[PDB]
UniProtKB/Swiss-Prot annotation, chains A, B, C, D:
Task performed by this protein: Channel that permits osmotically driven movement of water in both directions. It mediates rapid entry or exit of water in response to abrupt changes in osmolarity. Also exhibits a transient but reproducible increase in the initial glycerol flux.
Name of the protein described by the UniProt record: Aquaporin AqpM
Cellular location(s): Cell membrane
Cytoplasmic side: 1-11, 77-103, 167-172, 239-245
Major localisation: membrane
GO molecular function term, any single one: water channel activity
Keywords: Cell membrane, Membrane, Repeat, Transmembrane, Transmembrane helix, Transport
Gene name of the encoded protein: aqpM
Family to which this protein belongs: Belongs to the MIP/aquaporin (TC 1.A.8) family.
Domains (record comment): Aquaporins contain two tandem repeats each containing three membrane-spanning domains and a pore-forming loop with the signature motif Asn-Pro-Ala (NPA).
Domain of life, source organism: Archaea
Transmembrane regions listed in the UniProt entry: 12-32, 56-76, 104-124, 146-166, 173-193, 218-238
InterPro entries on file: Aquaporin-like (IPR023271), Aquaporin_transptr (IPR034294), MIP (IPR000425), MIP_CS (IPR022357)
UniProt membrane topology term: Multi-pass membrane protein
Length: 245, 245, 245, 245
């Protein structure tokens, strides 16, 4: 019912929110932990002061912002705010192919602006110390291990979306909060492994701004956050379709 | 249906609750962390013992109290308990202008009393050490950076309120919990930047009591917490109206 | 519809659950923090390792157990599991006076057994080190300050119960989770002040077992946890009745 | 309506998710805390950096994954993902005996694969340092104390399932989130006592992989996690049936 123009604006706003608040909380954690001594290399600062509590806090900053976005924009654009979700829905004929690129562009732009505006609010340290919450393999984690993490994590996210937001039998009203909390849980577990992106746009924004303002080049890892989420999402969509066929 | 007198009493109670429990949790955090050594100046004590866990805990003390208030008073006054929300609703003709001042006065009074009564329960240290949870720019954060944070934070709060509480299509029953959790998430991210007020009354109460009992004068920062939230709220209300027009 | 005998058994089980899981989490926190160095006297161990994160964790152990109990027993006994709630409902003619004593006795017994069984699971240290999560004024907090805290805290709890569980306009299904989360929020704020009991039975259980197994006599503080909660609950019930009259 | 083959696949996926994300978060906590100094023997690393905050974080990693699974698979297989739940339902004629073994086998297999795949993502340290989140009595806790903990914990889980998912009067849509949060709360309290398994399969997976990849033999404790959960679940199912008879 809503025009594609307005729906793309909604996707831009939703992804802006996702990155500003979610990735922002991770940058803040590193900023307030800066100067502290970590027990081992695997602990880079997130978890130094609050242990796994730091990870569930970041997970919830993402989760509550995602839930808020879905309740505010779900009835407008569907609030995908994730290229992997858009592609996942498309793979099972739940979203028109003609609108896939428009949505993804809006999401990438929203993520980039969200990261940029957060940097303006928090200061340069959000990038030089916090890395603007950019997702990258943690110490000792290989390219393929991070890839596997993103596939499994996005699989859970997408299969949940299929059951609570796509399925006609889904209980009305619960989609936003369940999807957000599911993301919070996935980040709590996978955050210290791959950064738990589950979203190509959510990784794109911080990567772009880190490059421009922190002189940090993480693009060599970007394929992990493109292939991993997309593969996990499509696999989940196809699996759900099979189980309910 | 409920008289303006009773609705104003409800707004007073709701804002009293918001400040007593929310701002109170921040004061308590500083009180139990007093004497500890922080890794750097940006970390003022909140996050010293629990990292970002401290921030999501404060965010939830606010969030759960807000949710409770909305379920208890929503059907009475609408439970705005925030001058920026009242003005935001007014800007899109969702609340009568003739009741704006009455509601705001009730909110300011409730916030002041909530802070005062908390001070009586917790002791003078809640103000001298905890600053009664007053919101102010954190170390290294400028006036305009804090302003930008309040605009973005209140924008998310208000657009969520529009979608889940104002919109006729909103799923019934979810407003209270979603609004509260959204605030918890915003505080988790922005707490260590501007204090994440999102509410002129929530800042007014602690400021007044800090001045009277802690000899702390933060009024020079008050414009941040008046202009920021109001601008963000109106911008969100107008944006929602546009997207759904 | 359910007999008083079965409803009393339900109240016993519900209060047993409330104390076993809620008060138990507080004892565990102190047990895992034992031996650590606190920054100041106000911090007794809860918050030493996780800051306010420790308090919201205890609050949620209580909150999730309360929500679970309400969804499991609400349709049976009404799941009051709190003498102050039973009395509050009675004060506004929402519960028969003839069943007040039966419910309270069941609640007191359930709390005592819950604390006892937890002690058996966790070991003697749950009492000698953790104090079985007994509520008492914290360092520097006077008898009247703790009393005021219990009144305000129980006021919020009861007014929320009136709006989401008692009121005929309340959205169905939300009562359990909202009541539980409200308690979690109140404990997060007031835990380090009065222990945030809000419940005469929840205090009775640990007090009894601490006396028998820890040789700790806290009965001199019990009036705080009887008068405070009851006054707050009745005041809230009467206030709600007035606002909606 | 869904074939047993597809329902068993769903149970496999659901239990895989439960173990990968839940048990995985516990392993991660130990990995990021490795090298730190604990205040006492009872604190093995979980709680070292975040106190009880670490436990509620692990509890929520389990809880959010469980909620997600129920919303995604509940309408397919019923999403038991726990042998004790399957047996509990069977004991009160709410699940056919002919499908009990098929479901349990699927659950055991899913748990084993979930643990294995997590090990691949996180690295060998997830097992050698994190023990893949295997549940075992904590320091000072005897075999019978851990057994009692599992009985009480699973009793709460099952009685909640009866009231919110089995009972025809249960409010629609709430089952997934309430069951998940209930588990989070139980783990917060009992995690540092018995590991708070409440699930024979959730313990089986980590035990198997720890044996194969960590050379750790915990099978001598397995009876605790088989008998405890099953006894608690059946006792709860029978109790609910009695109270509502």
């Amino acid at each position: 019912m809503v025009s594609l123009t307005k729906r793309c604006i909604a996707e831009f706003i939703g992804t802006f929110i996702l990155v500003f608040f979610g990735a922002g909380s991770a940058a803040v954690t590193l900023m307030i932990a800066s100067g502290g001594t970590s027990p081992n290399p695997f602990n880079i600062g997130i978890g130094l002061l609050g242990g796994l509590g730091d990870w569930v806090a970041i997970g919830l900053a993402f989760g509550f912002a995602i839930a808020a976005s879905i309740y505010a924009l779900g009835n407008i654009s569907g609030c995908h705010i994730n290229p992997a979700v858009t592609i996942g829905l498309w793979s099972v004929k739940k979203f028109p192919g003609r609108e896939v690129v428009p949505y993804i562009i809006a999401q990438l732009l929203g993520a980039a602006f969200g990261s940029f505006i957060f940097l303006q609010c928090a200061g340069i340290g959000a990038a030089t110390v916090g890395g603007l919450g950019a997702t990258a393999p943690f110490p000792g984690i290989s390219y393929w291990q991070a890839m596997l993490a993103e596939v499994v994590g996005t699989f859970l996210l997408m299969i949940t979306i299929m059951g609570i937001a796509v399925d006609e039998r889904a209980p009305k009203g619960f989609a936003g909060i369940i999807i957000g909390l599911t993301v919070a849980g996935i980040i709590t577990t996978l955050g210290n492994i791959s950064g738990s992106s589950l979203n190509p746009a959510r990784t794109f924004g911080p990567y772009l701004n880190d490059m421009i303002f922190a002189g940090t080049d993480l693009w060599n890892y970007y394929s992990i956050y493109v292939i991993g989420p997309i593969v996990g999402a499509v696999l989940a969509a196809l699996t759900y379709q099979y189980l309910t066929s």
